[PDB]
Structures are given as C-alpha cells and as structure tokens.
Design a binder for this molecule. Sequence first.
Ligand code: 5GC
Length: 330
Amino acid sequence: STGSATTTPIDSLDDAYITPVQIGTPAQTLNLDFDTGSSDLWVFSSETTASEVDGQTIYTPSKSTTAKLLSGATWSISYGDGSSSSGDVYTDTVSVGGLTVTGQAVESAKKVSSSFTEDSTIDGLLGLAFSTLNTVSPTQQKTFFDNAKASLDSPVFTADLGYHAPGTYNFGFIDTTAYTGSITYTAVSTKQGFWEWTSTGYAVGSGTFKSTSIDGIADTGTTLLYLPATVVSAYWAQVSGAKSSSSVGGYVFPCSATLPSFTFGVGSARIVIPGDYIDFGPISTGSSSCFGGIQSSAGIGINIFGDVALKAAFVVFNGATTPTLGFASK
Ligand SMILES: CSc1[nH]nc(N)c1S(=O)(=O)C(C)C
C-alpha cells in the first residue's frame, strides 16, 4: 500500500503545516500537524475542556462505530516550545492520503495548553518520530507509520514541504518526479527516539563551505532552524544591523535587508536554503524589525533541522531495519 496527502501552511509565515487525516467510521476529518519530532497522535475531541477549544475541529469517538476506549490508558506530553496536552486513548481507524491503519491509538485530549487553544487551524498532532517516545501509559503505543510499515510497498515516508505553498507527505514510495538530481542518504541514530543525523557542515551566502559535524534532528514540527551559536553568529554577521535580542528572544534583522542563503551539508551533497526562507517577518505588526529563521540552539540541548531547512529539500525518512535519512534538492 501507499498513501499521499497534501500538507498546507497554516499562515503566511509557514509557522506549521496541516495535513487532513480521516479518523473513525464514518470518517471525521481533522487537520493534523505531522511532527517527525514526536510520537503521539493526539486530537482535540469531545472530551477536551470546553474553555480550551476555540475553533478547532474535534474528534467525537461516540460517533465512530470503530472507536474503542483503550481501557486504563492515559497520555501526557510536553513539547520543546513549552506547550503541552494530555488525556485518554481510543483505538480507531485512521487514514492518511488513502493509506489506512486499523487499531491506531488516537489520543483524545482532555487538556491542552494555551498555545494549542490559540491556534484554531491545528486540530492535533500526528507523531512520526520513533515509537519509543510515545507517552501512552501503562502500555506504550505505536505511531501511524510504525503501524503502517509492514503493509507499505517500501518502509519509508517522505516530506516535501513548500515555501509559502502546499507540499506533500507520501507513505510507502519515493516520488522520483518530486526532486532534482540524486538523493543523498545519511546515517540515523535512534538513541534519543528522533531522526537524528550529522550534517557535514555549512556555508553562508556565496562563502566557502566549512566542514564541521553538526548533529541534529529532522523535525517537521519545529518551524525554524536551530544550530550552534558559532554557526548562527557567522550567518547573522553577514546581515547589516542584525543582532540577538534577549527581549525578543533571538536574532532580529532590519526588515529592509536582503538575506543571504544558508547551505547545509548532507554527506558530500549540499542543500541550499534561499535567503527568503529565513525571513519570519515583523516581530510585531508594523515593526521594521524582522525575526530570523535561523536561531541558536544553545539552551535547547539539541540542534534542530526544522521546517526552514526541510522545506528546501525533498526528505526521505527511511524506516528500514537500520533507519536512514535522504535529502535531495528540488
Ligand atoms: C516563528 S516565531 C515568529 N516569527 N515571526 C514573528 N514575529 C514571530 S514571534 O513569535 O512573534 C517572535 C519570536 C518575534
């Protein structure tokens, strides 16, 4: 089997991407944030505290003839941005882009933090990291991908995120029309539960490439590119007037600037992030100070190749017995 679904930016900045997902019988379609940095599929639901729902579409398990309470199971997750959610668990039929999994754990939110409430466009998350990170207790549950894997034509999924445009998540096949040149594959460590890999270095604009190992995670659920302070300082030093602002919470730059590109290494290959991809617009409406798309990972404890990086590439998440990651230009 295979699946193919379009993923769409939630706003004009590509803060996140939503992908329609069918849950239950008859289908209830919710727009979920596919997150390769976590491993829970959770949804706004009929059980979510009413004051914490503000425009989201909810899953109502009582209206699904295939929903079953997973008795005794609870979940609770905290994300890198400080947001969180928790609740109980049902199993139900879940389909993405034509690919169907029966008995998928669907984690029903009883509580969500303010950031989730305030984002009317995201109805929940679909985790695509390794199932060892799944938070369901006392019986850990598998991700949608892990459940689907054996039925897929090939044990892979791909992320093809758009810049200010829709893109695609494919399951079970590699669309050879969706990228240019060749795909370069690189080793993955699953030791922390992430799609963790090591970039071979970077360049800023038309500058020389610096060969240096940068260990980080491929994370579709993080908006920006978070890298070591040395790398980030070298980037922003090429933008007149750019500075790190503790009050704003990162690097800002004059909105009048033209940003340089940023290149990262994948083995001997190179992925180029255009300057425009690094512009996250005015810090507040009407401001002439703009927020940068490359930020320091110091304090986070891990480097994160978030959407800013991933949307510059066609990315293969290879879930073979020894997982690997592939990157192509597009
Ligand atoms: C990607 S977060 C962001 N992008 N553009 C902004 N203005 C913001 S913010 O959250 O208001 C803050 C970090 C400046």
